[PDB]
Design an enzyme around this catalytic site. Structure first.
Site, PDB file in Angstrom:
ATOM      1  CG  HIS A  83      -1.658   1.190   1.441  1.00 48.66           C
ATOM      2  ND1 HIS A  83      -2.834   1.542   0.916  1.00 48.66           N
ATOM      3  CD2 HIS A  83      -1.480   2.076   2.399  1.00 48.66           C
ATOM      4  CE1 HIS A  83      -3.379   2.694   1.349  1.00 48.66           C
ATOM      5  NE2 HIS A  83      -2.524   3.179   2.186  1.00 48.66           N
ATOM      6  CE  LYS A 112      13.768  16.629   6.396  1.00 47.67           C
ATOM      7  NZ  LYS A 112      13.775  17.529   7.576  1.00 47.67           N
TER       8      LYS A 112
END
Lengths: 155, 155, 155, 155, 155, 155, 155
Positions: free
Chosen positions: F88, F135
């Site tokens: 996935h 980030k």
């Protein structure tokens, strides 16, 4: 066949949260999860009562005070136990589960078990709003479904 | 949101300590920790009642007598169990945790669990006022926070 | 700060489900999960349209027909791919994910990805209503939240 | 609940097959499978158009010509890719799957993927009419079910 | 059954070749193969247009200029990619295959893939006119067959 | 030589953030990072729009709604994907990167990629405001620099 | 609560850089990073003073001369120490860190520590403008934030 089930709308429901302060870096995520769940299912934040207790040990005696309030529909009990060096973890997790379980039967009221009982810190991080979900969110969602179910079984 | 939390001021609070005599070389450190915590948080030493019992087994029936006193705000239950050769430790730690846990629900009163349940003597030394703290000090601090919380939930 | 978020009430929302027939022993559980989620969040079952397609490959071209309907608020795309002996799995999972992803951007409409992509049959059983949840239930819940979010971003 | 599903009767349906010539010893079995499936489901053989292309690479640009025909209800794309010594297989299988997948969305028309993508010759033999079936037969059967489904979604 | 197939006569067909200059020691063999194939199948050498580009990366944007010419029946895209030390090979082979594949669909025109994508120099030598054939020759032969097929599908 | 570069002043710039709710224990840190970056570079918090979506899958279709707003200078897309047991992760990370990448080209507008794609929970913790930075902070800083650059390239 | 924090605008701020000449192939990258950071945050290049010293040992006595200037708001101390064969590295890194640290307290002025202290040349290359950033850029950014903070704490 008579089928009783609880819908997931929280409109008009009034919730108690009892959340421990030990491991608060994670418990803070579970309480965020529980409140988010109630509010996004149509609960009002002003219909939530949050009780902070110093540790998981203290959660059942505090849950007992909240669950005795006429105007609380369900109680969500939240904490984080992480296994350490000694057998202490075994005894706390045993007593908090038994205590909440007994109250729920005695007072005939939903008390949901959003208490993480993790062997490791990594496991606890996984279940407090990372890759294995938020058990605060799940506990609140159980409480919404159980509060409604009780509503429909009484009338 | 209604938030109930207990402050850490011990002014005006009245405490019971039940402390076992077995392993007294360590339990004496935990009781020192508990009393230091109460006094330095603004409690009076004359508002502490200390009950000594012969072992951890005897702590719940004695805690039950103290917790039934109208003028005791919280009870701090203190002992040291160290695992030995036989399964005895398992049964004592199981029953003392269950007994205190039940009383606290039954009498609707904070009873804190300052009972060390150590696999080894070294572990017990660590948690009775060396490198992993003093669980007598921690238990007293839970009792101060819970006594105040109960104060604020009743009124 | 302007914050847009979708609530989890499904009242008045109209859903399309596209579900594949391959692996139907599991896909039937995911479609049950999706419909349960919509109905218990306040959606009407008569406001659900279910389209069955023969396999996961066929889901995007069918989702494209449903998503072009003015009266569909979100589409929930459901299937089960289980890796076999050949590289076929890689190519189907690549194309179904890309196809749905592109449609959702092109038609400016939520299309949720309730497609299990499992290495093993055991993994697929875990995610179709056993120990790792129901990704049909999760996909429907994403679609409810996205439909509302879109509602609030347009007006 | 509105349920749309395609029946498996091929009466009145008109099919395109695009089949590659590389690996023709196997592709010939897949095309036999596809035509058998259409005819035994009530399709007329005179309502099938078969286009032969030199390889799997050429299938999407030819499928694009067939799928643009008004009188083609679905296209069945058939080939055999077998992994060799170089990474070439990866790139052909990637592009043929993406190309067909895109056309099907763009032209809003079923294009079924009867392309074997086998690591080994033995695997390819298994899936071209021996012990793991005939994916030409399966692709045709998907095309029959999708053609009817589209019929019922338009009217 | 309507069967469309392309014959292998190149009489009257007009070809574009786009060939990269990197690895020219091998690409020169593939371009020789492509031109030999066209001429010995009855194509005129004056009906071939050869475009040289600096590398495989540049082949699709140049193929796009040739394929847009009304008087080009098919384009044969030729190069040699050999895997090196870095992941660069993966990205170039991915983009050149996708780019050519997309153009062929967009402009509805055969663009054949005579690009060797070899793990090793030995593999590349094998496929550029030694023991595994000449993929320039094969690409040209696909282009001859596809140009004719398109001829017959339009009229 | 004409040199265009973006300064890092955010004065007068208007930002969209799209942040997923899955893995919210970490995503909450990235969104904190993004907003801190905008505000301490001279952006107004009232010129930030935050859109919450249920998962990383939903980020591109929501980013598409924000990026189409005339009064949004750049979009910062934020999430956390952590590899699990099944393939996935590969498919979600592939589609979210491609979707955002395409929108940015299509709408000719900066959309920055503050999506963590971590093999492990530990890696994700490192990049969401511990030892490998934030980030979210980096994505916002890219968006500030790109918004200004676009400003200077248009005039 | 009174909160003091430094914004990242460098307008009107005046900086000193002290940069060593040993390892200049890397130190040149760190000084580029520092100046880029100041200029793109709104500092004027004419408000930077750069002092070159022969080695890291000499940085504190030179930083002391710059930091004593009334018209310098912060000093950025830049160098590269790479561990060699002897214990020399230990003693230089110890003294340069202590010297700068002491000056900053003594003169009540920000002196930032952009000195790489690497075990290996590869590590040093990583931190002088490749995959682990530029610690010259980071040191300058600390100096911008500290200069402003000091501005706001004085008035």
């Amino acid at each position: 066949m008579q089928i009783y089930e609880g819908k997931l709308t929280a409109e008009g429901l009034r919730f108690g949260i009892v959340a421990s302060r030990f491991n608060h870096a994670l418990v803070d995520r579970l309480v965020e999860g529980a409140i988010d769940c109630i509010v996004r299912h149509g609960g009002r934040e002003e219909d939530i009562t949050l009780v902070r207790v110093p540790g998981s040990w203290e959660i059942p005696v505090a849950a007992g005070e909240l669950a005795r309030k006429e105007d609380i529909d369900a109680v969500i009990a939240i904490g984080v136990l992480i296994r350490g060096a000694t057998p202490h973890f075994d005894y706390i997790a045993s007593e908090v589960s038994k205590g909440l379980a007994n109250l729920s039967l005695e007072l005939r009221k939903p008390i949901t078990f959003g208490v993480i009982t993790a062997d490791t810190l990594e496991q606890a991080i996984e279940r407090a709003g990372t890759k294995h979900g938020n058990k605060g969110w799940e506990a609140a969602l159980s409480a919404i479904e159980m509060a409604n179910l009780f509503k429909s079984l009484r009338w």
